[PDB]
Scaffold this active site. Structure first.
Site, PDB file in Angstrom:
ATOM      1  N   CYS A   1       0.860  -1.167   0.000  1.00  9.83           N
ATOM      2  CA  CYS A   1       0.000   0.000   0.000  1.00  9.83           C
ATOM      3  C   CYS A   1       0.905   1.228   0.000  1.00  9.83           C
ATOM      4  O   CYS A   1       2.116   1.142   0.270  1.00  9.83           O
ATOM      5  CB  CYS A   1      -0.963   0.017   1.185  1.00  9.83           C
ATOM      6  SG  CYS A   1      -0.205  -0.033   2.806  1.00  9.83           S
TER       7      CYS A   1
ATOM      8  N   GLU B   1      -9.078   9.136   3.049  1.00 10.20           N
ATOM      9  CA  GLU B   1      -8.307   9.191   1.808  1.00 10.20           C
ATOM     10  C   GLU B   1      -8.919   8.219   0.817  1.00 10.20           C
ATOM     11  O   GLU B   1      -9.428   7.168   1.221  1.00 10.20           O
ATOM     12  CB  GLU B   1      -6.839   8.833   2.067  1.00 10.20           C
ATOM     13  CG  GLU B   1      -6.660   7.404   2.597  1.00 10.20           C
ATOM     14  CD  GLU B   1      -5.217   7.078   2.926  1.00 10.20           C
ATOM     15  OE1 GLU B   1      -4.347   7.995   2.824  1.00 10.20           O
ATOM     16  OE2 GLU B   1      -4.968   5.900   3.283  1.00 10.20           O
TER      17      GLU B   1
END
Length: 151
Positions: A37, A86
């Site tokens: 990620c 986000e």
């Protein structure tokens, strides 16, 4: 920017790379999670950032980058209720080279059958990162992941 991404990396045998974050990560050290990620840097595409972090964290080249959960958003709150939001589109990709894992980033890793990993995400979600659980829990994304290697 409030922009992030997630990558689930598969090998030619159709196994998923589950990684364990190193103990030196500031965030979620020592936790088992999906392959990579991260966040894009200045004027970088999401794709470019994924390629960059796969190469740096895992020493690996990738191909066939494919969106599997474009609408995913990761919402985190701290103990005082300060919220971080986000967008975090999720992708699958294929490894095209041998791993050369960076130990400052990743302390362990396993190639595992996706069906087996999902069994554990269902039974004991707390043993994995919260975004890994939340990504796989979306039915459409999970179908896409389960069927990615067979196209």
């Amino acid at each position: 920017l409030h922009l992030a991404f997630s990558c689930w990396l598969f090998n030619e045998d159709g196994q998923l790379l589950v990684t364990r974050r190193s103990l030196s990560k500031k965030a979620w050290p020592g936790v088992w999670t999906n392959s990579v990620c991260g966040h894009p840097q200045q004027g970088e595409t999401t794709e470019e950032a994924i390629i960059r972090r796969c190469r740096f964290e895992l020493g690996v080249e990738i191909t066939d980058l494919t969106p599997v959960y474009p609408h995913f958003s990761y919402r985190a709150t701290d103990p005082n209720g300060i919220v971080e939001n986000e967008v975090c589109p999720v992708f699958a990709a294929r490894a095209t080279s041998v791993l050369q894992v960076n130990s400052e980033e990743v302390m362990d890793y396993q190639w595992s059958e996706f069906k087996s990993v999902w069994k554990s995400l269902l039974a004991t979600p707390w043993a994995f990162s919260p975004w890994m659980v939340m990504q796989a829990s979306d039915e459409q994304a999970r179908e896409r992941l389960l069927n990615y290697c067979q196209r």
